[PDB]
Design a protein around this ligand. Structure first.
Ligand SMILES: Nc1ncnc2c1ncn2[C@@H]1O[C@H](COP(=O)(O)OP(=O)(O)O)[C@@H](O)[C@H]1O
Ligand SMILES: Nc1ncnc2c1ncn2[C@@H]1O[C@H](COP(=O)(O)OP(=O)(O)O)[C@@H](O)[C@H]1O
Ligand SMILES: [Zn+2]
Ligand SMILES: [Zn+2]
Ligand SMILES: [Zn+2]
Ligand SMILES: [Zn+2]
Ligand SMILES: [Zn+2]
Lengths: 827, 791
DNA sequence: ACATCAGTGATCAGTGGTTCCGGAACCACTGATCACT
DNA sequence: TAGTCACATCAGTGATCAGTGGTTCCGGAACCACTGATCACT
């Protein structure tokens, strides 16, 4: 029938026509190593194929995307369904759109602020309402019964001019009544008029007081005035009342919002955009934002009536500041009106379903106004997880990245249950996740890339994960199932009371002003369920202050009082998964610092001696070293008439960003193109006489960059490998023990073996007399560190405090943190 | 394991809170009536919600309100309908179906550089210029410019301007200033009429000049037209500006779009066919059928056949799917410029069955449109195999063959109009047989049926139309007879070119000679018999009105009659205001709260609006001021309210309104609300409206009606009502000729002209004609064979 | 007792964006009037 | 085979306007100045 999915012919990088058939509508995992090929095998190729198939079948634009995107690197793919990529691929990074808009609830914010918010004009606080003639005619009831008035049709309001001809025309129609400059005369015998003299021409139409059931004559003259007077009349207390119709404000005033319309409060749209920031929120905030990312008129004046929950009186910015939980609980129960209930029931249902899935993932501490940059990858990953589990399309295919980033252990287990829900839905699941518990908890597991780099990409194991245990060759299989594992260091480097960096007064956001101490020169790790605070505790305060002081920057100090520890460190250098550089001038080889070295060595070639090639001339940055047509990229770009772009290798450059003149020099029997393209593995093997570069390259190989090549582009390598090369380079940069620095979650996409390799690397960094604090939720980071601090019992409400600051074994003994609980479980 | 798809609470128009389950990994058919909601459910709600689901699951890009409580057992929905098609011909059929790409891979595996290797699928893809001819870059037609179209009237001064961008608005004044700059730069006078201008001066005008001239540099209307589509937003503007680009295929490869030298050298080794030197220019020109035939047999050497065999099998399978579709006679070089709705439906069906996605939903429409019955039989086999791929197939098709061949059937809209939109059957269709309330089942069981008329309107050879010398394309100068004064009908196999004959030759000539049309007559030496006719009328499924502004009253013209009727009230007299006052599209009487539209409408792009009665209206779509008149005890709102049949039983002693309502009652679809928006009326309903309107024009029958295949939009009973309409017309003297794949319709038509010995270019001549029985006795038509096995 | 690789740093020597410019006028489609007869 | 006879209007019929739908369209190089190396020195 339809119960299995087959892929055949995965031939790319280390993948060698790798193939596999699996049971559709089950839970399946993809394991292996870093760079083992699973990344592209699952995301780049299989997801590309499925999405391309569905978009071509349906009418997505031209049914296409990237012109078939990648060519099919599978001899045959069968039994498929439209793939769904649950990945950290991308999000909404627009500064105009904050997480409030990204959460598909800015529309609902505007919906509520339209009518629930104060529907009143800013100028006079009068309920914004539009012009109507029916109210004009019905206003006769408002004016007391029997009170004299006049049927005054303002035909020509205040427009002065000698208009005896107009008098004659009005007679030609036939009314016999008129009033000019507020004085009545008969059209039969009107007064004289001059252009200089002001003439307020409101023609009397009929003789009437407030009578009973006089609507016949009333309407007769009244719609007449609504045309002649053009919509306006007055019933004065001639014995006051004005029978006028005005749009927007009833009094003809301007409005912050022209009416009760949600888009009026959309600064991403020009409705709410400031004159001086255009929705960006900057000029230093623009003078008309002052913290609120909205126009001051459209901040609260026309929308202060949001009676959400209790005491509800909110500005658009106020709801923005309402955290996830704050706004969700506010909207859980609120009384704004029956029509509002009818037209916002869908609003409540969408929001509550979204929040239920958000809790199913365990994500509330983020705020509606919280900067989208706070997305930790795992955050947006969980956003999409909730979206797709709520979608409920049964049988759809779903390929998962690793969402554990920014998550706790048993929280991740509960999320694993969340996905097993989708498995039970009949949906097909292919997984990728370093969490062990995720492993051993799937209907099927396929381990790949027996070797990590280009050398290994085959499916070393393919079974119920039992064949992973039976598959000893799978190094990751051995690491996970227990054939081998990382080890706890015998010695936890003792505290250093003298040189200790201690933050005091840290109350930024969730933080409760607690003070946190950290020894310097000995390894340390920080723990806490995501949302606890450590992230901004360091970034916004510790790292921010230390960096802008030691290096004289202007970073945000954060909410803190003081930070001791500066005197013990020569400087701070924040280092994280970031790349080396987006520009073409930034490439592995060039930006690793070996650029000038290779340039000089190539100048030292025998040919370069008989050629006089300057080292800077061996740079593509200068024109001499590069092909000017390529501008330093060694390729030809080809765009044509409304057709996709193509690229070709440049011939003079030979694809090396170095014209043939530069490439002719063949340092050590190798041109610049060669000494770029060869792998980092053979680079460490090579340059043996060159002490510095050889040490750098072998350090890179130890970090595990052998299969990568020095000549690769910067974009071609992941941020994890970028930090790998950065740590390898800084390894030989005279640490002196005082370069105590900071680090983020490094466990991203690392197999246990390379995890332990980097563990040894950081052990060396610590033995250098230094400490690079690490923000890692993982267990082994703590189990190997020698000082540990947990941000309160749990995240958010738990966070902003400390439960065990001291030794890793101290926190292990401490059960106040689940981190210490799992430590007690294992060491 | 949940293997069934359930819908819960579909509410729209006559359809209301529809709940039902279907078996997944099965095949589903739909039945009912026009406007009955069967189509609205199958596509307008089911696939509507499915596409909503996949846009909320659009994992790429930035990711309406289906009026349904819930859905369960869902799968991604695929739309397959005569409507779901586009007008982009550049992507020829081969490229669109991707057949081309796998042939390119085959030829890549067929490395044969010939005496004067180098074979990858990219090098064969004329779509992009690795292989595409150097001159045209694989473009079907050279984008030249027509001097006559650019300048229709040379007598006018160049300053006055002939091209559209030179005429309207401040934009036109800018364009005229740039043209004056071009004149003062190049050296052509700006005010000299093209007639008085030198020919080289006109060519320089149309090619512009270099340099920037006020400043703005222009190089004639060659590339600004190409930029206009990019600049403009709506597709209408770009289509307007693309219409008049001369199409002159490049002679260097003469339509065989690829480098003529490369196709002969790099890949002449292809022995695809009679062991001939199959160049890929030839491959491109090869029709679907012929190209498949020579792709079946070909020797390229042991290595090449070994490394290309799998792609050949893939080609055979997908082209077998296309053959079951029946568009094998269509040629690969064919584009979609003249593509038909049924042809596009077939194209999508073949492409998305070749894609071979298992466990994916498909909503489908009438496959029989522009398809022979045996062809649709093999197509039903194709769809049954598609179902064997574990694919759900929601379908709507009146044709019985598709019916009674699905794992499940659902009949909807027991009534057709607003009254009926609910579910009258859902099951294995055996309980459809049990379900006697199903009108489709009643027709199936013979409760209602149609056949030949008791007598065929006698054909007079004297008063006959004739089409001699019609050779346009598939045609070969055939002289064809058409009885006049009676109902003849054009018939034959699908794609047989009889349509093109009609539209380009028959209809074209008749319209330009009688109705004053100025369209191209194709290629015909002459036509005769116009002396027996006065003015033709070509009618099809097109909707009568695309806006709610127009309504049954406005179209029928009875609207002003009823307005005057209301003016006849004594209250109307005393108020002293015109029938236009009583109108609903009139400024004065239209309440500003709705512009007299009844409910109040305001909405943004994201989600649809909701109807809300207005204080003035309460659904009255009027103003009480006007409604105060109650002519014959009825307000204007009430009069516009009661639908056609109730109005018909009303207005009895009146005359013109009586004729209108009698026409509509005879039509029998009077259920339609008098104020029912034209947009809320199906194409078949609009067709019935059009035939009713023409039924009230006293043409004496001298006129002749030509018609498309109208099965769509008309149920069996709707077709019977239309048959009665045409019967009355022809008894009034009218002539008729209809393209139609329905045996009953043609057997009812008193004469048949069946053209086409073979589909496509194999047709182009009368294979038989005469009474339906006469044409049947001649098996030269397959439709004739069918009219023979019947009767 | 150097080391040719070290070691970064503000300016200076290449990059880095951003765009105005708000609309009615004008013209094509069909309705209705508007005769008109 | 002949001059007077005198008791308006449905329904075309479309022109023709005269409203509605939509048009549409340009100039881009400048302007604001901002931003990653390279010797320099240590
Ligand atoms: N931009 C911000 N706006 C508001 N609150 C923030 C912001 N950044 C951080 N926070 C606060 O810091 C906490 C972040 O916790 P986090 O450090 O991610 O947990 P962990 O310490 O487990 O990594 C949240 O509780 C939040 O209230
Ligand atoms: N101008 C034209 N462009 C393309 N094809 C044409 C043209 N004129 C005639 N034909 C031919 O006429 C055929 C059209 O078939 P058609 O008449 O729609 O089928 P049927 O005979 O069933 O109505 C095409 O197959 C084509 O060979
Ligand atoms: Zn006001
Ligand atoms: Zn602002
Ligand atoms: Zn180059
Ligand atoms: Zn060509
Ligand atoms: Zn209204």
């Amino acid at each position: 029938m339809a119960d299995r999915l087959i892929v055949k012919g995965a031939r790319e990088h280390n993948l060698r026509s790798v193939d596999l058939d699996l049971p559709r509508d089950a839970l399946i995992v993809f394991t292996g190593l870093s760079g083992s090929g699973k990344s592209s095998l699952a995301f780049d190729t299989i997801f590309a194929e499925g999405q391309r198939r569905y978009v071509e079948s349906l009418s997505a634009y031209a049914r296409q995307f990237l012109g078939q995107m990648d060519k099919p690197d599978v001899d045959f793919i069968e039994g498929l369904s439209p793939a769904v990529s649950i990945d950290q691929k991308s999000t909404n990074r627009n500064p105009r759109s904050t997480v409030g808009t990204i959460t598909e609830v800015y529309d609902y914010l505007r919906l509520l602020y339209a009518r629930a918010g104060t529907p009143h004009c800013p100028t006079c606080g009068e309920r914004v309402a539009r012009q109507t003639p029916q109210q004009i005619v019905d206003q006769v009831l408002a004016m007391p019964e029997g009170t004299r008035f006049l049927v005054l049709a303002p035909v020509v309001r205040t427009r002065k001019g000698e208009f005896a001809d107009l008098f004659d025309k009005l007679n030609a129609q036939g009314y016999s009544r008129v009033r000019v400059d507020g004085v009545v005369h008969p059209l039969t015998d009107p007064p004289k008029l001059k252009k200089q003299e002001k003439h307020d021409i409101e023609v009397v139409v009929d003789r009437l007081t407030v009578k009973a059931a006089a609507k016949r004559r009333l309407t007769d003259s009244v719609e007449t005035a609504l045309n002649l007077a053009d919509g306006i009349v007055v019933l004065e207390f001639v014995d006051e009342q004005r029978f006028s119709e005005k749009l927007a404000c009833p009094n003809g005033h301007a409005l912050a919002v022209d009416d009760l319309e949600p888009r009026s409060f959309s600064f991403n749209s020009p409705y709410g955009a400031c004159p001086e920031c255009s929705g960006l929120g900057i000029r230093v905030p623009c003078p008309v934002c002052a913290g609120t990312r909205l126009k001051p008129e459209i901040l609260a004046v026309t929308l202060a009536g949001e009676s959400k929950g209790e005491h509800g009186a909110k500005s658009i910015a106020e709801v923005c500041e309402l955290s996830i939980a704050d706004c969700a609980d506010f909207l859980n129960a609120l009384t704004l009106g029956p029509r509002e209930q009818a037209i916002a029931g869908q609003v409540l249902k969408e929001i509550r379903s979204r929040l239920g899935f958000l809790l199913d993932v365990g994500l509330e501490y983020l705020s509606l106004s919280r900067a989208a940059a706070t997305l930790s990858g795992g955050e947006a990953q969980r956003i999409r997880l909730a979206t797709q589990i709520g979608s409920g399309l049964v049988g759809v295919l779903y390929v998962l990245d690793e969402p554990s980033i920014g998550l706790h252990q048993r929280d991740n287990r509960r999320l694993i249950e969340t996905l097993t829900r989708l498995r039970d839905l009949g949906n097909t699941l292919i997984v990728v996740e370093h969490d062990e518990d995720t492993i051993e908890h799937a209907d099927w597991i396929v381990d790949i890339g027996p070797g990590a780099g280009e050398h290994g990409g085959r499916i070393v194991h393919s079974g119920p994960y039992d064949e992973l245990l039976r598959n000893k060759d799978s190094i990751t299989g051995a690491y996970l199932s227990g054939r081998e594992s990382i080890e706890i260091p015998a010695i936890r480097r003792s505290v250093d009371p003298r040189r200790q960096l201690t933050v005091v007064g840290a109350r930024e956001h969730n933080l409760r002003g607690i003070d946190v101490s950290f020894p310097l020169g000995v390894l340390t790790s920080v723990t806490g369920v995501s949302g606890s605070g450590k992230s901004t505790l360091v970034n916004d305060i510790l790292a921010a202050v230390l960096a802008n002081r030691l290096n004289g920057a202007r970073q945000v100090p954060g909410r803190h009082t003081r930070v001791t520890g500066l005197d013990y460190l020569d400087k701070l250098v924040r280092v994280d998964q970031s790349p080396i550089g987006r520009t073409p001038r930034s490439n592995p080889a060039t930006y690793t610092g070996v650029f000038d070295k290779i340039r000089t060595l190539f100048a030292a070639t025998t040919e370069a001696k008989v050629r006089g090639y300057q080292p800077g001339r061996f740079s593509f940055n200068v024109k001499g070293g590069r092909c000017e047509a390529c501008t330093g990229d060694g390729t030809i770009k080809i765009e044509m008439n409304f057709l996709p772009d193509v690229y070709v290798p440049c011939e003079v450059c030979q694809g090396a960003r170095y014209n043939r003149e530069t490439l002719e020099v063949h340092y050590k029997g190798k041109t610049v193109s060669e000494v770029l393209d060869m792998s980092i593995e053979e680079a460490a093997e090579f340059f043996e006489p060159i002490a510095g570069v050889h040490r750098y390259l072998r350090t890179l190989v130890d970090v595990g960059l052998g299969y990568v090549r020095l000549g690769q582009p910067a974009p071609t390598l992941s941020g994890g490998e970028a930090q790998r090369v950065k740590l390898a380079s800084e390894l030989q940069k005279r640490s002196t023990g005082r370069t105590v620095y900071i680090l983020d979650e490094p466990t991203t996409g690392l197999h246990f073996d390379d995890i332990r390799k980097l563990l040894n690397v950081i052990n060396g960094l610590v033995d250098k007399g230094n400490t690079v604090i690490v923000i890692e939720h993982n267990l082994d980071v703590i189990k190997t560190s020698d000082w540990i601090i947990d941000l309160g019992p749990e995240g958010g409400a738990g966070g902003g405090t400390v439960v065990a600051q001291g030794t890793p074994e101290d926190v292990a003994a401490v059960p106040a943190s689940y981190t210490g609980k799992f430590l007690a479980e294992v060491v």
